[PDB]
Amino acid sequence: KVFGRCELAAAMKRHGLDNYRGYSLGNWVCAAKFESNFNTQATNRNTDGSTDYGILQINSRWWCNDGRTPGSRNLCNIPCSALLSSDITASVNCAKKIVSDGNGMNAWVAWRNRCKGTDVQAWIRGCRL
Ligand code: NA
């Protein structure tokens, strides 16, 4: 599913991301735009053989199981495929674990490069939240 901006903003809020570890909602919407273009089905393969999955481009070297990333962990206890669903629950739950791991939202390269330090409130402007 390809979310609208406010539709995603509204779902993230319901699943408890707004201000999660002190990250306001616009951070999370901005990270999703630049990671996945708001598409739950996005995948991207990395040089090290791992793959990034879903609207929040969660990596299979540490967080989910894809069966093809040798020696990797599965810290979220889930199949990677389950982060491609139209229901963003699994993505959100796993992202809460990632943002808690010590590096905050710097875990997401496109957040660091494209969202950090910008006016992230724009990403929720206009929305009925
Ligand atoms: Na894995």
Data resolution in angstroms: 1.2
Domain residue extents for the chain: 1-129
Q: What angle do CA 69, 73, 76 make, to 5 degrees?
A: 115
Binding site, annotated residues for substrate: 101
Catalytic residue among 7, 18, 35, 119: 35
- For the annotated binding site, the residues are 101
Whether residue 35 lies in the annotated active site: yes
123 Cα to the center of ligand 1, angstroms = 31
CA of 60 to the centre of ligand 1 (A): 4
| Class of domain 1-129 as given by CATH | mainly alpha
User: Tokens 């962990």 label which residue?
Assistant: 73
> What's the gap in Å between 46 CA and the centre of ligand 1?
13
Pair of tokens at residue 123: 């990403």
Three-state helix/strand/coil letters over 56-97 = CCEECCCCCECCCCCCCCCCCCCEHHHHCCCCCHHHHHHHHH
Alpha-carbon 102 to chain mean position: 16
Residue 64 contacts by C-beta under 8 Å, 6 or more apart in sequence?
A: 53, 58, 74, 76, 78, 79, 80, 82, 83, 94
Closest CA to 104 of 3, 24, 1: 24
